[PDB]
């Protein structure tokens, strides 16, 4: 963009993303693309539960979109807010990760939670999938857990894998535990 | 004399984009210069990955080749109309004199 305010133009996007992740969590955040021209930015949040975002009869979408304007004044320029449904949340690494990260917060058996997630992802589409859990499994000594199925092989190797990757954290009384989700789809 | 500069990462994204602009303006202005290529410059930058902040220690090498396209349009008129609404591809950043 502008030499002068490319950075300024950028700071705002972080600002927008900041709120969406905070609010939209229940909705199931996947990605927030931000396209722009002059004072009219795109922001099309992708969600598993489009309903949660929209609100009833689009009541919430109004508040949020309005909240956006407060942050994005005329100078930032009014922004829209498109929302697309995520077909099969099961495919989104981000979701799959978040999904496991939540269960871990619950205190579910991590190894199993991992199996299940690989199974769900594996179960609907996905040529291959793999999940990784950080350490402090069961609030135990730090460990690592795995689990994978299908060819992640032919992925990892950069050549047009089209492997969605996602990481999800998990705050816990015991400590933070990162979760990694890899999903393999038809390559290019 | 509206010099148009079209730059983009993808060679196709421009060929499509700049081409559109050629056809449109043909309607209300002179006959465009025709999309001139302007060679592609590659930039190699070795810098801190992030801006001043986390991991000043980080580095990394980047090469980003960027493509250009002028297609000048002299004797302007309602060129502006056909151009303004008409654009398409994202992935292109166009600036005009």
């Amino acid at each position: 963009s502008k030499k002068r305010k490319l950075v300024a133009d950028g700071v705002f996007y972080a600002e927008l993303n900041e709120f969406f992740t905070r609010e939209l969590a229940e909705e199931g955040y996947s990605g927030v693309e931000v396209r722009v021209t002059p004072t009219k930015t795109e922001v099309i949040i992708r969600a598993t539960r489009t309903q949660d975002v929209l609100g009833e009869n689009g009541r919430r979408i109004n508040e949020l979109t309005l909240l956006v304007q407060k942050r994005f004044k005329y100078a930032p320029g009014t922004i829209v807010l498109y929302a697309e449904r995520v077909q099969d949340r099961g495919l989104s690494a981000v979701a799959q990760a978040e999904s496991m990260k939540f269960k871990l917060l619950n205190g579910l058996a991590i190894r199993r939670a991992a199996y299940g997630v690989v199974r769900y992802v594996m179960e609907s589409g996905a040529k291959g999938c793999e999940v990784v859990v950080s350490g402090k499994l069961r609030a135990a000594r730090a460990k690592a857990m795995k689990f994978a199925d299908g060819f992640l092989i032919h992925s990892g190797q950069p050549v047009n894998d089209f492997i969605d990757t996602a990481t999800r954290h998990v705050l816990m009384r015991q400590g933070v535990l990162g979760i990694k989700v890899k999903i393999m789809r038809d390559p290019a | 004399k509206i010099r148009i500069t079209l730059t983009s990462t993808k060679v196709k994204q421009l060929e499509n984009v700049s081409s559109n602009i050629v056809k449109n303006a043909e309607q209300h202005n002179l006959v465009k210069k025709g999309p001139v290529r302007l060679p592609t410059k590659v930039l190699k930058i070795s810098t801190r990955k992030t801006p001043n902040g986390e991991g000043s220690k980080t580095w990394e090498t980047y090469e980003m080749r960027i493509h250009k396209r002028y297609i000048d349009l002299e004797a302007p008129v309602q060129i502006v109309k056909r151009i303004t609404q008409i654009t398409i591809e994202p992935g292109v950043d166009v600036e005009v004199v």
Binding site: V7 | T47, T50, P51, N52, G53, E54, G55
Partner: peptide
Amino acid sequence: CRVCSSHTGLVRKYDLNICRQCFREKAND
């Protein structure tokens, strides 16, 4: 810098990132 506030070395242009690290981090995904 702007995000992380690591002063140690943020590029002006982005004027963001912890430093090069966050610059690379954001870039990474």
